[PDB]
Amino acid sequence: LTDPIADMLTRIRNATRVYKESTDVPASRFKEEILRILAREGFIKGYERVDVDGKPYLRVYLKYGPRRQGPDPRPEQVIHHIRRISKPGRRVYVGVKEIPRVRRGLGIAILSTSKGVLTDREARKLGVGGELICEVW
Amino acid sequence: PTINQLVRKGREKVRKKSKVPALKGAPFRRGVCTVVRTVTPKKPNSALRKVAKVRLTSGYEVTAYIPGEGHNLQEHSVVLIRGGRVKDLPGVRYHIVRGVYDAAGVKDRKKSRSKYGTKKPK
Amino acid sequence: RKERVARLLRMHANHREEVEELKAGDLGAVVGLKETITGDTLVGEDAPRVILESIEVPEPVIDVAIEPKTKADQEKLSQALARLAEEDPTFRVSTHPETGQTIISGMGELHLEIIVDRLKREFKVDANVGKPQVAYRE
Amino acid sequence: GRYIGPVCRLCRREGVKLYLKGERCYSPKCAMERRPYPPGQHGQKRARRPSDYAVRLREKQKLRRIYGISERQFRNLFEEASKKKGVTGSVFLGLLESRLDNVVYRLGFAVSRRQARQLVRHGHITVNGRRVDLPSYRVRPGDEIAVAEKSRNLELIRQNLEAMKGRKVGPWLSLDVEGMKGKFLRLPDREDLALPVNEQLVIEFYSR
Amino acid sequence: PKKVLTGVVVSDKMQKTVTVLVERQFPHPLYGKVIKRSKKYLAHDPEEKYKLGDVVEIIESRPISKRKRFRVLRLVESGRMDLVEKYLIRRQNYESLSK
Amino acid sequence: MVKIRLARFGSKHNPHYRIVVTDARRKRDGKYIEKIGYYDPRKTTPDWLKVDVERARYWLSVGAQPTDTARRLLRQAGVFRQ
Amino acid sequence: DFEEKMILIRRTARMQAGGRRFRFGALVVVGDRQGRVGLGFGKAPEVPLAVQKAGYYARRNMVEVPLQNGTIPHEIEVEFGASKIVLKPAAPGTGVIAGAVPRAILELAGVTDILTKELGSRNPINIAYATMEALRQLRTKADVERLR
RNA sequence: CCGAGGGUAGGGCCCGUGACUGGGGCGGUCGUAACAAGGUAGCUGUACCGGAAGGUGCGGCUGGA
RNA sequence: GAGGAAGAAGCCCUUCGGGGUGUAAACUCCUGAACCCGGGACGAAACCCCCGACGAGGGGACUGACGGUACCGGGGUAAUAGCGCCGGCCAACUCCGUGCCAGCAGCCGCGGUAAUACGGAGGGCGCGAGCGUUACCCGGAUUCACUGGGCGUAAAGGGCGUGUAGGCGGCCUGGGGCGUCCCAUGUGAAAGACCACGGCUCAACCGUGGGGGAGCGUGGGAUACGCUCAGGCUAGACGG
RNA sequence: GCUAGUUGGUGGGGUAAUGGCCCACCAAGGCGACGACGGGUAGCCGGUCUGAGAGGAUGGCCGGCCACAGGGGCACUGAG
Ligand code: SF4
Ligand SMILES: [Mg+2]
Ligand SMILES: [Mg+2]
Ligand SMILES: [Mg+2]
Ligand SMILES: [Mg+2]
Ligand SMILES: [Mg+2]
Ligand SMILES: [Mg+2]
Ligand SMILES: [Mg+2]
Ligand SMILES: [Mg+2]
Ligand SMILES: [Mg+2]
Ligand SMILES: [Mg+2]
Ligand SMILES: [Mg+2]
Ligand SMILES: [Mg+2]
Ligand SMILES: [Mg+2]
Ligand SMILES: [Mg+2]
Ligand SMILES: [Mg+2]
Ligand SMILES: [Mg+2]
Ligand SMILES: [Mg+2]
Ligand SMILES: [Mg+2]
Ligand SMILES: [Mg+2]
Ligand SMILES: [Mg+2]
Ligand SMILES: [Mg+2]
Ligand SMILES: [Mg+2]
Ligand SMILES: [Mg+2]
Ligand SMILES: [Mg+2]
Ligand SMILES: [Mg+2]
Ligand SMILES: [Mg+2]
Ligand SMILES: [Mg+2]
Ligand SMILES: [Mg+2]
Ligand SMILES: [Mg+2]
Ligand SMILES: [Mg+2]
Ligand SMILES: [Mg+2]
Ligand SMILES: [Mg+2]
Ligand SMILES: [Mg+2]
Ligand SMILES: [Mg+2]
Ligand SMILES: [Mg+2]
Ligand SMILES: [Mg+2]
Ligand SMILES: [Mg+2]
Ligand SMILES: [Mg+2]
Ligand SMILES: [Mg+2]
Ligand SMILES: [Mg+2]
Ligand SMILES: [Mg+2]
Ligand SMILES: [Mg+2]
Ligand SMILES: [Mg+2]
Ligand SMILES: [Mg+2]
Ligand SMILES: [Mg+2]
Ligand SMILES: [Mg+2]
Ligand SMILES: [Mg+2]
Ligand SMILES: [Mg+2]
Ligand SMILES: [Mg+2]
Ligand SMILES: [Mg+2]
Ligand SMILES: [Mg+2]
Ligand SMILES: [Mg+2]
Ligand SMILES: [Mg+2]
Ligand SMILES: [Mg+2]
Ligand SMILES: [Mg+2]
Ligand SMILES: [Mg+2]
Ligand SMILES: [Mg+2]
């Protein structure tokens, strides 16, 4: 593994477009702090710190919309899109003025800073910036 | 290509080539006519166009088109020319400017006179 | 076309004299002009843009063909006698319909002589001259 | 300078009466009452479907023609609007209206902009008691758009004035008649006016 | 202030002077990724007390010869031969970049 | 030496000076050390002078010598009243 | 009712012994300017038939598009197979900055103020089908919270 | 002492040009190699040969049966 | 400029009835660019002299190239219009002539007897003291792709390993605070650009004021991520 | 692949002043794929032009610095 983070969100993304009830990602504090976010923003139901063969995982409990009417029943997605921005190849770091503004509001972009793993709305109100971790809508 | 590769190799800026080298960057150039004959054009056209091979003051010799019907140009005509290839003609990459130097305008020209070097009919 | 007339001279025996004006019906010399040539009218800017009576008479009497030897320096001559033709307006350059040689024509032997002799000993020209070629037929 | 030429043909191609002549436009002797097809050799010929670009060209030409202004002066105005704060459309038409000689006509001093221009040019108008002969003066809210009171004793101001004893100039305007004054209080609202111009199509013209 | 930089001594084979390798990092003006570059400084050891591996700081200073415009402010870390090879293995790598 | 003078700005028959302190041996309109206020000779708006008197003092004190028409505008708005 | 604008009429051809036989196709957007749009592509052996058939499937295939003061709630970028359309939300003063293809499908969506750009294949059909799917993908603060 | 530069001698890099020569791009004579199993499946690296396209050996690929 | 015919003449077109240029002209009247007279500047208040004290404050005088110009006032004649285009892109259509000729051409192409693609004409479109063309730069070109591209068959995976430099790198706790973020402070000249106001009758031009940002220097602070150092694990990797 | 004033040092000259700036002696160094050496082209910046922007492109006029005054070399006087 080279990017635990990308792996994670990409565990979500991979699992949601096949509508898994949950998905387990290998564990880290930093990963939880971000998961804490997805939930707290209504992207996932939630998560817990379970176990497989004695290796700390987190189960993530996914979330969708209703079945829909038509030839495609499949529910619209809650997390529509979620891609890494800062990266081990290319670090991305924004200032507070520089802080991007997702989907004209309706999406977010979680970002590590020296005052927690906030969100874009948060960082603007908490007046800081940092490594733009990803973006979700 | 990865981001390291562009840190490393960079990207190559595009280099455009001139299609009027013999101008030496000038808007126009003057020349003396070394040869005035006609030439035939390629498939699918068929005609006898009026070219002039011209010695430039950049010291290029080039061969130029003569626009219009009928010219008064010939060996030793001091002429002035401009960028502009002629598609049907191999190796023509300039035109003569009509109504300049020894280049006459065109007799009985009424529409688009300016492009044929032709004063206004009273 | 419009031209500046900076100063006006007058040629004496042993000196030039500067003047401020030349009245009608008098000759002198002007410095300043650039596009001007012999046989041309010249008027004050806001005047009847008239052209003086040109001149006009004799057509050249003697004809001599000139061969640009070799050959990328034919046109040393091409720009040579265009400088010449506004310097002497009595010779006449022409190129032959058939045969394609260059045919300077003149007011007499003597006239062609110096014009030719100049063309070489003043313009180097790699060239020789003589009897024009004849356009034959079957 | 201005278009000056034959001026019925304008509206004729423009499929719309632009009220350019003034005293004759209402007359049934106007060109548009009699022949409302385009000018020259091909008017009663059965029209071809107009390209999106035609549409915006034709439409932009309509306005530009109304105020009888050069394409140069026109675009520079329009260009100003964009960068000015808010709605490029209104503000253009606004700034387009806020120019002198079209005031002079909206206040019926003269019969058309054409006649209006001549008025301004000939000095027969003034703003704030200062003579102003410049057809372009961007009149700003507050001004005292007189008539040169040395030009008050004249047959043609009288005529058009006298015929404006109690008609209603737009909201943004105040024709104190008799004394031949006026006043410009308000740069128009979008709704404040109607002219045969889709204010947006022009914005889409220059968006090309 | 007098500029202070920090590096490893990569050459003590000079008389009262040492070679001091200095890395600084920054992101690429177009590609944002962080890059290293490095620059070897000739630094004045009046008391010849600085040897190989000696990570040291150097202070901007009044010139002492040509290209010796810093002297060593203090010994900070010592015996870092791993950064000495990190350069010599690159340096030596050059012999095979010829033709 | 160091001087207070009028560096012309503006346009043709539209003077608009810009009284200023600079090093004599400049170009007139050259790099000045510090602006100390304008002056519009033709007096075309109420403000055709506004010497920063707080400052104009500091310069006279540590060297600045002035134009025989810089004082004129300086004395005008009295940097000189005892 | 609705308004129709043909966006693309075009004459294709098939081969058979002793010559080529044609088959006109046409792409027609249909709309209200108040929020309901639709796109249909009918091809009949004669121009008008198709032009009218295209309109039949046009209505028979409609889209939401929820306007915010004559503009879209969120910038969107949908790729319809090489063809890729990009819609940006724009101020009351702007205009409809699009092609002719997105332009029609935007104007009769009753959009008045958009920024767009066609990357990719700019094939009018494909670009059309794309601008559609992108509109169909639009969402407001409501549905966003609804889902959360 | 150094020293503009002048001279002597041997190198290196570029540009122009050259009897004649090499193929290359553009605008009738000979065959018919490729494209259908193209009438010997096609292409291939190499090798040898032949007016020419090409043929043939060895080995390879299917983008052939 | 306003008025000015179911609409002159000439020209163009025609199914020969008509259509067009065209309210355009003529014609009526109204204004009055140039010109003619009369006035006529701002830019110039200091330097100096006078009272005072050669200082502060006060008062007096001389000096204008542009310029008899700007502008102000009187009088006052209908008074230059031109260039490109009209197959598609691309707004603008007919007749005639021509007949792979003469020519056009930015690309597609057009011309071999009915050419909206050449040449003229009428008409039309667009600009207007300008209109076109040539050269060059950026754009369209997301066609060197950071934003923002690709590589089975379209150009594109190295013939395959091994490995140097390099780039990148699991999970937990801590020290440092290098990156990264935050505040303050200095610097970031003037002109310019930008928003407001104002001087020239408008504008171009020009004056005043405001707002500053990047980027660097200095001081303070945060600690998540990246780094570094210190310790621990066993999911990677290696070994028995 | 580059280097003998070449890189360092002691001592001294020189300067307004540091310095291999110049000179003697000693050491044997200095630089280089993070592109030395070499060849091409170029005065640099405020700016300007373009571009949605990131970016490209460009440095006439105006303001600042540099550099040259027919090609070179030199030194004088001087605060310079
Ligand atoms: S009369 Fe007035 S309205 Fe009727 S055409 Fe002539 S101008 Fe247009
Ligand atoms: Mg042919
Ligand atoms: Mg042909
Ligand atoms: Mg001749
Ligand atoms: Mg001549
Ligand atoms: Mg009068
Ligand atoms: Mg534009
Ligand atoms: Mg380096
Ligand atoms: Mg030393
Ligand atoms: Mg020494
Ligand atoms: Mg379908
Ligand atoms: Mg794709
Ligand atoms: Mg295409
Ligand atoms: Mg919805
Ligand atoms: Mg020597
Ligand atoms: Mg020598
Ligand atoms: Mg000598
Ligand atoms: Mg040779
Ligand atoms: Mg075969
Ligand atoms: Mg065969
Ligand atoms: Mg075969
Ligand atoms: Mg086969
Ligand atoms: Mg073989
Ligand atoms: Mg044989
Ligand atoms: Mg054989
Ligand atoms: Mg075989
Ligand atoms: Mg096959
Ligand atoms: Mg009739
Ligand atoms: Mg008639
Ligand atoms: Mg008639
Ligand atoms: Mg009229
Ligand atoms: Mg009168
Ligand atoms: Mg005065
Ligand atoms: Mg006294
Ligand atoms: Mg006078
Ligand atoms: Mg003047
Ligand atoms: Mg008067
Ligand atoms: Mg008249
Ligand atoms: Mg044009
Ligand atoms: Mg166009
Ligand atoms: Mg058209
Ligand atoms: Mg007929
Ligand atoms: Mg013929
Ligand atoms: Mg033409
Ligand atoms: Mg015909
Ligand atoms: Mg035909
Ligand atoms: Mg034609
Ligand atoms: Mg054409
Ligand atoms: Mg654009
Ligand atoms: Mg380009
Ligand atoms: Mg290209
Ligand atoms: Mg990329
Ligand atoms: Mg591609
Ligand atoms: Mg292939
Ligand atoms: Mg392989
Ligand atoms: Mg190999
Ligand atoms: Mg390694
Ligand atoms: Mg690392």
Ligand SMILES: [Mg+2]
């Ligand atoms: Mg890590």
Ligand SMILES: [Mg+2]
């Ligand atoms: Mg820090």
Ligand SMILES: [Mg+2]
């Ligand atoms: Mg500034």
Ligand SMILES: [Mg+2]
């Ligand atoms: Mg004003």
Ligand SMILES: [Mg+2]
């Ligand atoms: Mg300012």
Ligand SMILES: [Mg+2]
């Ligand atoms: Mg450890």
Ligand SMILES: [Mg+2]
């Ligand atoms: Mg010393």
Ligand SMILES: [Mg+2]
């Ligand atoms: Mg040296």
Ligand SMILES: [Mg+2]
């Ligand atoms: Mg020595």
Ligand SMILES: [Mg+2]
């Ligand atoms: Mg030695």
Ligand SMILES: [Mg+2]
């Ligand atoms: Mg070099």
Ligand SMILES: [Mg+2]
């Ligand atoms: Mg050189």
Ligand SMILES: [Mg+2]
């Ligand atoms: Mg140079």
Ligand SMILES: [Mg+2]
């Ligand atoms: Mg772009």
Ligand SMILES: [Mg+2]
């Ligand atoms: Mg680009």
Ligand SMILES: [Mg+2]
């Ligand atoms: Mg300058």
